[PDB]
Amino acid sequence: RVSSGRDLNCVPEIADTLGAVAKQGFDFLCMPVFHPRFKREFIQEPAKNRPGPQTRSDLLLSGRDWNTLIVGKLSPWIRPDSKVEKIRRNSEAAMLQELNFGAYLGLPAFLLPLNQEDNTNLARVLTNHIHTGHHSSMFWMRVPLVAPEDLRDDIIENAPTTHTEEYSGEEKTWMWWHNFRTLCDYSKRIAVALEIGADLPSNHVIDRWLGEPIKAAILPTSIFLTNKKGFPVLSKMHQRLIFRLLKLEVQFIITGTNHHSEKEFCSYLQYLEYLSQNRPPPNAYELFAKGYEDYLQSPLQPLMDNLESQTYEVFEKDPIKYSQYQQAIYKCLLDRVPEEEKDTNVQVLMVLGAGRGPLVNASLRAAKQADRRIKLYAVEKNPNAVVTLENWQFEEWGSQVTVVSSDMREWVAPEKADIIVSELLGSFADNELSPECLDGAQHFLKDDGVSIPGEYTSFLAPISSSKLYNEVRACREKDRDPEAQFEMPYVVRLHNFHQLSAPQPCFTFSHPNRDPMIDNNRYCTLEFPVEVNTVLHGFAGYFETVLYQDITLSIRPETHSPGMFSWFPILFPIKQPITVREGQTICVRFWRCSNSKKVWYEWAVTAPVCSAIHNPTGRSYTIGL
Amino acid sequence: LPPNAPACMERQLEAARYRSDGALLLGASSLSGRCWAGSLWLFKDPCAAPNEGFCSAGVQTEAGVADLTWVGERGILVASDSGAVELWELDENETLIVSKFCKYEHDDIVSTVSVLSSGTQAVSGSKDICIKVWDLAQQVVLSSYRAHAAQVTCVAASPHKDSVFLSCSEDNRILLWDTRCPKPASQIGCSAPGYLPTSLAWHPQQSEVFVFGDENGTVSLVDTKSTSCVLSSAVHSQCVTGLVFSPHSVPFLASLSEDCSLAVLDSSLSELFRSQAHRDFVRDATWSPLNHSLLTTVGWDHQVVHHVVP
Numbered sequence: 055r056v057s058s059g060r061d062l063n064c065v066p067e068i069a070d071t072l073g074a075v076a077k078q079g080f081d082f083l084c085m086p087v088f089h090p091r092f093k094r095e096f097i098q099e100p101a102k103n104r105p106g107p108q109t110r111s112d113l114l115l116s117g118r119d120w121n122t123l124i125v126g127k128l129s130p131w132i133r134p135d136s137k138v139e140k141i142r143r144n145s146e147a148a149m150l151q152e153l154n155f156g157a158y159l160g161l162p163a164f165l166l167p168l169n170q171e172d173n174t175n176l177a178r179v180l181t182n183h184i185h186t187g188h189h190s191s192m193f194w195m196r197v198p199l200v201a202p203e204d205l206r207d208d209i210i211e212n213a214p215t216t217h218t219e220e221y222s223g224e225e226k227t228w229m230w231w232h233n234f235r236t237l238c239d240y241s242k243r244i245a246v247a248l249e250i251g252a253d254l255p256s257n258h259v260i261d262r263w264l265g266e267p268i269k270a271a272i273l274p275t276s277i278f279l280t281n282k283k284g285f286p287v288l289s290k291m292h293q294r295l296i297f298r299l300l301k302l303e304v305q306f307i308i309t310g311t312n313h314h315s316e317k318e319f320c321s322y323l324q325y326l327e328y329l330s331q332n333r334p335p336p337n338a339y340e341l342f343a344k345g346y347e348d349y350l351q352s353p354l355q356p357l358m359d360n361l362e363s364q365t366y367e368v369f370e371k372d373p374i375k376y377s378q379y380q381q382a383i384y385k386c387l388l389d390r391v392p393e394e395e396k397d398t399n400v401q402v403l404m405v406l407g408a409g410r411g412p413l414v415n416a417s418l419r420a421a422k423q424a425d426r427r428i429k430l431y432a433v434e435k436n437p438n439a440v441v442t443l444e445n446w447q448f449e450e451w452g453s454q455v456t457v458v459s460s461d462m463r464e465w466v467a468p469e470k471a472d473i474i475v476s477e478l479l480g481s482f483a484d485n486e487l488s489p490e491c492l493d494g495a496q497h498f499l500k501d502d503g504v505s506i507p508g509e510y511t512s513f514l515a516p517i518s519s520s521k522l523y524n525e526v527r528a529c530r531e532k533d534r535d536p537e538a539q540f541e542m543p544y545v546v547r548l549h550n551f552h553q554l555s556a557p558q559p560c561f562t563f564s565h566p567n568r569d570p571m572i573d574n575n576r577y578c579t580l581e582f583p584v585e586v587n588t589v590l591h592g593f594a595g596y597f598e599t600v601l602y603q604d605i606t607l608s609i610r611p612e613t614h615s616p617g618m619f620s621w622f623p624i625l626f627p628i629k630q631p632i633t634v635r636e637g638q639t640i641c642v643r644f645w646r647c648s649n650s651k652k653v654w655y656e657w658a659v660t661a662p663v664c665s666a667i668h669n670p671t672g673r674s675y676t677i678g679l
Numbered sequence: 680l681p682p683n684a685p686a687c688m689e690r691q692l693e694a695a696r697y698r699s700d701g702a703l704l705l706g707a708s709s710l711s712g713r714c715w716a717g718s719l720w721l722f723k724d725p726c727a728a729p730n731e732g733f734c735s736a737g738v739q740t741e742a743g744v745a746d747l748t749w750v751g752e753r754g755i756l757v758a759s760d761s762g763a764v765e766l767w768e769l770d771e772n773e774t775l776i777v778s779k780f781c782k783y784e785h786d787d788i789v790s791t792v793s794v795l796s797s798g799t800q801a802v803s804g805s806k807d808i809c810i811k812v813w814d815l816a817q818q819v820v821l822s823s824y825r826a827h828a829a830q831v832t833c834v835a836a837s838p839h840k841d842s843v844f845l846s847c848s849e850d851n852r853i854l855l856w857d858t859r860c861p862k863p864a865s866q867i868g869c870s871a872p873g874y875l876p877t878s879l880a881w882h883p884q885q886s887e888v889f890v891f892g893d894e895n896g897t898v899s900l901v902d903t904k905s906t907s908c909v910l911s912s913a914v915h916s917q918c919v920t921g922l923v924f925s926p927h928s929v930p931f932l933a934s935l936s937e938d939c940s941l942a943v944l945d946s947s948l949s950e951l952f953r954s955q956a957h958r959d960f961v962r963d964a965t966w967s968p969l970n971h972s973l974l975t976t977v978g979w980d981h982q983v984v985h986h987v988v989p
């Protein structure tokens with residue numbers, strides 16, 4: 055259940071060692087590919103001409119074992135950023151030599167330390183290796199939660215450790231990573247191997263790493279406390295952290311020698327398996343969403359496109375959502391037909407955008423539960439779904455349901471509706487163009503008719519996540535603007551991210567719309583107070599809707615409808631990550647724009663720095679009318 | 680070839696130490712090839728080294744030897760790549776080398792060891808940044824110290840004081856220690872960072888002065904009581920991996936380097952001898968107790984050289 059590996063800096067025979075760590079339960083081994091103390095010279099004779107072999111042979115393992123079981127390690131004497139020119143040069147040749155041998159062997163990852171502030175020349179040699187061969191190898195940068203200088207015992211009489219808080223100084227190692235990965239151009243092949251120390255820092259330091267590509271956590275044996283019986287275990291705070299890392303499915307690495315000599319080395323590993331099997335199980339939402347974490351999908355456009363059969367199938371296997379719809383219809387019948395009229399009065403109810411008819415059925419179940427009489431129109435422009443409707447109305451619904459194979463903005467209705475019902479809502483509420491559709495339909499609502507839904511509001515929340523920035527970055531396509539992937543929302547089960555401020559309402563729409571001048575364009579300015587240092591990579595979009603009175607649906611996290619998985623949030627990325635300091639305000643601007651043919655959005659940040667206006671005129675993303 | 684002695688001796692020689700009577704201790708590691716390990720050798724005939732059939736005793740360790748030191752006349756203290764400090768003890772017959780304790784207390788390669796003046800204690804330095812004080816009698820760690828911020832490069836015990844020893848590190852600190860004080864370590868040396876210190880040698884006569892070499896080939900002479908770096912010389916073209924004072928009443932200072940050369944210096948750090956005999960890194964040096972102008976050096980070229988010093 056937990057994928058884990060052993061870190062060693064001493065491997066006398068690779069064959070035995072691998073067997074010993076395989077025996078102890080580990081899935082892989084991080085080891086030197088050259089001997090850690092074998093400093094090599096490349097410039098100065100005689101040491102330059104040291105007889106070979108320079109390291110052990112690749113014939114000692116199978117290609118399968120190299121490819122899956124061995125993580126290389128950079129020799130600790132390699133210092134590309136030494137103040138000494140000779141050492142700078144020797145280490146460049148040595149780092150290339152070692153990275154090439156790693157690529158020669160097919161290693162799946164290779165570890166490299168970030169153990170000081172200036173790693174500029176380290177980054178440059180790594181960048182220059184990545185661009186030589188076009189390989190698939192991973193590079194795990196070994197970064198501590200707490201720099202060793204900020205962790206040393208207070209035992210130097212004339213150089214004491216400062217006992218003041220330094221909010222940003224305590225984050226310094228995040229800035230080591232962050233510079234290093236900027237320099238290297240956000241290569242997808244460069245991840246974090248976060249090293250965890252005996253005493254954790256404040257939460258804000260730990261939260262700097264939210265949204266970062268952590269592929270591994272390194273746990274030294276040092277940090278394991280001992281319980282009464284004598285096993286290795288972890289403090290409650292370390293356990294909290296392990297639980298967070300498990301949700302990131304990192305691989306855990308155990309480094310250091312055995313410090314619980316009475317017990318063996320399974321015990322460390324077993325504790326993690328213990329913590330792993332002993333976490334809260336995934337709810338119904340989190341079962342549905344497994345496999346979609348941070349997976350970028352295009353927002354459905356059910357107006358412009360005819361949805362596929364299986365797409366309506368997923369729409370329908372959300373029972374919570376139609377319970378709410380049924381209840382909203384139920385309450386609405388009772389308000390509209392008094393008990394003494396329950397048989398003289400028949401309500402004309404129109405499902406607008408009927409699909410395969412889950413709302414048509416919810417309306418029937420609602421009029422039975424409410425014991426009132428209804429007349430049902432099922433309008434649907436997708437003629438492939440109208441096939442399903444007309445088979446349902448012949449086989450079951452009967453003449454109670456009139457299927458109408460038409461666009462609701464075209465349909466000349468025979469009579470007016472008491473209630474129009476629709477599920478035309480996207481993850482950003484109005485992003486499937488439900489405002490435009492219901493406006494062309496309201497002319498055949500009665501002057502006192504209800505619309506279900508009656509109201510919906512969208513929501514927005516600045517987020518940080520370099521993992522999603524890179525994914526968005528990967529979406530460059532030939533034959534279009536090379537930044538176009540940054541100007542267009544994405545539906546995504548947001549996972550490895552940090553939400554920087556509380557969501558805040560963006561655009562609201564009401565139905566029926568009682569403007570004498572209906573206008574669905576919008577301009578909205580939002581200020582988000584940010585109380586952390588972070589980096590802004592875009593905006594999370596959610597929505598709420600009032601179906602009827604107090605019956606609602608929401609995917610706003612604060613008020614999420616429990617158990618309903620019909621909508622993942624939507625992501626509005628920006629071209630250029632923006633640095634945001636503690637106490638600053640993120641000001642964002644959101645426009646809803648439209649043609650006679652297209653609706654779209656445009657957005658900028660204007661504080662703490664300006665961004666470009668994104669998706670201007672719908673050059674990169676429209677929603678078809 | 681005595682029993683229990685490997686038929687062949689690893690190519691990379693790290694340590695070369697003369698006992699009181701003039702017998703030569705040799706530490707070696709295998710830093711390349713299929714198997715990465717080490718061995719300890721005793722040569723009552725110093726001129727027969729490095730030859731394996733002409734040794735008095737030998738043994739194999741699990742892993743490489745990074746530093747070495749005598750513990751009296753029968754004890755051998757080993758800094759292992761395994762993270763173990765090891766104590767080996769000579770035979771009564773002095774024809775075997777038998778393991779006494781192997782304690783895995785460091786979490787990375789142990790890089791340096793030094794016995795304290797009483798001979799009953801030692802301090803080890805490691806790549807795990809910790810420094811440990813050991814009871815060789817009890818085979819336990821008395822203290823563990825995380826004073827440094829990077830790997831520990833060298834720990835040198837005081838000649839005549841169990842309480843005092845030097846350490847240096849890649850964090851650019853030279854720490855004078857005194858376990859009598861509640862904050863035992865004390866940062867000394869120049870305020871300007873300079874270059875990383877790599878080697879330390881206490882002065883055998885003036886127990887308040889020491890010398891340290893840096894990664895840039897400079898040797899420096901320092902008084903722990905007065906001002907800051909009175910004297911220094913650019914002796915080498917690369918890192919200074921070792922500094923050994925001669926037994927003479929007015930001692931000479933031997934200077935080792937990755938530039939593959941030996942230098943012998945006087946009290947003012949002027950150059951007296953210089954040897955190009957080695958074709959790889961010069962790793963250790965000891966003066967003969969018997970003839971005080973004889974100077975032995977070993978290296979990664981597997982040579983054991985014997986120098987005569989004017």
Ligand SMILES: CSC[C@H]1O[C@@H](n2cnc3c(N)ncnc32)[C@H](O)[C@@H]1O
Pocket residue numbers: 356357360361369406407408409410433434435436439460461462463477478491
């Ligand atoms: C169940 S998701 C919304 C459904 O409403 C339909 N729909 C969207 N816009 C319109 C429209 N203008 N007229 C009729 N049906 C529509 C879509 O084809 C889809 O089946």
